[PDB]
Amino acid sequence: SPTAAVIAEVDELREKIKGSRNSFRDQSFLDQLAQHIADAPHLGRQPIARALVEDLRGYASEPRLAAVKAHINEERDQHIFSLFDASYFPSLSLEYLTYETLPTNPHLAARYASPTMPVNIIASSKGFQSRVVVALFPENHIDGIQRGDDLIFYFINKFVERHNRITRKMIDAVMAEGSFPLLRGADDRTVEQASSWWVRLHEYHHRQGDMPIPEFLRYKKLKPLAGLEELRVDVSGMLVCLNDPELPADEARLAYEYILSERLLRYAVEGIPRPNYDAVASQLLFNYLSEHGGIELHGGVIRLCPELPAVLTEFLDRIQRIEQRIHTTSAEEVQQNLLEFTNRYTDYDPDAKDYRHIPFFAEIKERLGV
Amino acid sequence: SPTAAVIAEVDELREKIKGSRNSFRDQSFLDQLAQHIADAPHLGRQPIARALVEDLRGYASEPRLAAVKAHINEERDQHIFSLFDASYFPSLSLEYLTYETLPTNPHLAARYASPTMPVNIIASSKGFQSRVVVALFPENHIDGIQRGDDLIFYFINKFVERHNRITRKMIDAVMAEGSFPLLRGADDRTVEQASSWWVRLHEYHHRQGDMPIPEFLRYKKLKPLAGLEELRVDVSGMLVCLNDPELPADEARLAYEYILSERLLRYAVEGIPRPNYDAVASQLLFNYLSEHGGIELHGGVIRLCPELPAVLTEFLDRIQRIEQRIHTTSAEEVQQNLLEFTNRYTDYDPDAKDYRHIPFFAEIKERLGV
Numbered sequence A, B: 001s002p003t004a005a006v007i008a009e010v011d012e013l014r015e016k017i018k019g020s021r022n023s024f025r026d027q028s029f030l031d032q033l034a035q036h037i038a039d040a041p042h043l044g045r046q047p048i049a050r051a052l053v054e055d056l057r058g059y060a061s062e063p064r065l066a067a068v069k070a071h072i073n074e075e076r077d078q079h080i081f082s083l084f085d086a087s088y089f090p091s092l093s094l095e096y097l098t099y100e101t102l103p104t105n106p107h108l109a110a111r112y113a114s115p116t117m118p119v120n121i122i123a124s125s126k127g128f129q130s131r132v133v134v135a136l137f138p139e140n141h142i143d144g145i146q147r148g149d150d151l152i153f154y155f156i157n158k159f160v161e162r163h164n165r166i167t168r169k170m171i172d173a174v175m176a177e178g179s180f181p182l183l184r185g186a187d188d189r190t191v192e193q194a195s196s197w198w199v200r201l202h203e204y205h206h207r208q209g210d211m212p213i214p215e216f217l218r219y220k221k222l223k224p225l226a227g228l229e230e231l232r233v234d235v236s237g238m239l240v241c242l243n244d245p246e247l248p249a250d251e252a253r254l255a256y257e258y259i260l261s262e263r264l265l266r267y268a269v270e271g272i273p274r275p276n277y278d279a280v281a282s283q284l285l286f287n288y289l290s291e292h293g294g295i296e297l298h299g300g301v302i303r304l305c306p307e308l309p310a311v312l313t314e315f316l317d318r319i320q321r322i323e324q325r326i327h328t329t330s331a332e333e334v335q336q337n338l339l340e341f342t343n344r345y346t347d348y349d350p351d352a353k354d355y356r357h358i359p360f361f362a363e364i365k366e367r368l369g370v
């Protein structure tokens, strides 16, 4: 494969520079890296590799990857190639991938517009093969810059994999029979459609409300608050799927089931030994819905109440009431009120200043190995 | 097996009460549980079961499991049976195990004495079969009481299993050849002895110093501080193994290798997505040793320097200098100085107020699946 030879050349350069991350912005290093890319028989002739070499060679006077980002944002082709520094995606250094785009619903893309690219990875260098790397954000390039119109990529093939490995067996073990009928036996293309709706609604709603990100990002990185923000936007997305009549009814109900099953099950067991940010918020959701009549526990399995849409609306309204006071109080005062809400419905240890998995999901982690 | 019939009855009672944790101190519940234990054909005959029945029936007036713990602490036999509520061992409710004790060196047990019981589990009920449950502490019983002379149990078979499954693989993948020569190819009986030394020294040193636990426990539960306290005691234990000439030379060197390999490798990769308390402190140690000449990295392989004992002594001296100021400053002021030290050598995210695996161990987690 010509692409196979390109990626082989990238993986060898990646191996050569693995011990050199502290030099990734040093011009002596970048000049040498650029030359090695330029001289790579297959990689060096790719248009996107011409762009990266240009950006790297100019980095001492312009610390941006403007030519690379212009190629990517204009979708000149379906190749992504760059030098990365993303602390939460540590496997990424010099990396290359090819992707394929997915069908898009016109109303969804118009009404809930964002620069989001749900794609499948077709081929990729080693860094992009890590299970951790489920997306690619503009600030992940070494220049660390993001613009509101930069494209953001989500690797839907990885979310399909995670759904089939974790969520499906949790649905079987944890939900009352008939809870997610459209998901039952659904093929990978159906899960792919649902997941692509999820990411599109997710990115759109992050930018909405009284404390949108990135504006208030630095107030929403604390574990409980990062999770609660994730949950704000995904509950918004579930409600859009339930309420917006211009979305196709079959696809919308499927996306609803996908987002709800993921937030009620897969995200709820994330993290060992303590829950991660997603799981704290999913456990808040679980306990909130339990105590407010949205779900019921019978024989250890979750029944979705017919009233759930009303309770989800109550929940999102509650979060929005807390955030609305940003107009009369400080960001820090709002944070304390979001933490107080979170802690009412989660297992917070005040001496460790951290959370424990609630017993319901601790038992499921032990039973299912999730 | 007569013990298999006992455990089967316990496991059946455990299933019956799994939904009732909120009732575990309700006297109506306890009366019923006690009656069911008393009436168990095999279980109910056991001296320790009669002790628990008596404790449970008296709980409304004396919320203590005094009879059970007197049986256990006196080693009246080698059975442990109680009703547990340990937030970090969530699998434990009504549980039963039989154990066998392990050899101990006489000088070690006299000079570093503590109420510690390194044991192998012979048989156990389901709660104790969780890989999470590596030890049993007196406050893990429902009464929540610990006294300084209560026996503390460590399940050495589980530590042997973890050393075989994780540490051995990391030694081969990460360490320069000859790094841990006594541990290489060592059999389970040998790792058992080393791990037994580790736990005895660990418990002993937790009670030593200017900020021992449990006295200062509530200041040492924050993730970095909990890890640093683990590391303080295990570095103390390494140094005893190197320095105390009344310990047998071969066994002491083996224990040194065990404690060092565990803290340098296995504990360093603990926690997903973020390091847990152990891993934060182990990454502190890694970077401190790297920066101060105790270890060297060559193409991603760790060499242990001949000077490492002197650098370990410097590291422990530094912790003790920070803690000594408890005598002239508040425990909060000491906490802040222990955090400052930790953060110099770890990857602290100031906006998340939490830690990331340092790149060296993030890569090993990816490479080895640990």
Ligand SMILES: C[C@H](O)[C@H](O)[C@H]1CNc2nc(N)[nH]c(=O)c2N1
Residues within 6 Å of the ligand: A137, A152, A202, A203, A206, A213, A217, A220, A221, A225, A226, A227, A229, A230
């Ligand atoms: C809310 C929480 O911090 C979460 O990790 C955020 C972080 N920043 C983000 N930024 C963008 N563009 N899209 C996202 O989905 C998120 N997720």
Ligand SMILES: C[C@H](O)[C@H](O)[C@H]1CNc2nc(N)[nH]c(=O)c2N1
Residues within 6 Å of the ligand: B137, B152, B202, B203, B206, B213, B220, B221, B225, B226, B227, B229, B230
């Ligand atoms: C120091 C840190 O909190 C660590 O987890 C402590 C906690 N309390 C403990 N208590 C006892 N008896 N033994 C131990 O090893 C520990 N570990």
Ligand SMILES: [Fe+2]
Residues within 6 Å of the ligand: A202, A206, A230
């Ligand atoms: Fe998000």
Ligand SMILES: [Fe+2]
Residues within 6 Å of the ligand: B202, B206, B230
């Ligand atoms: Fe400890």
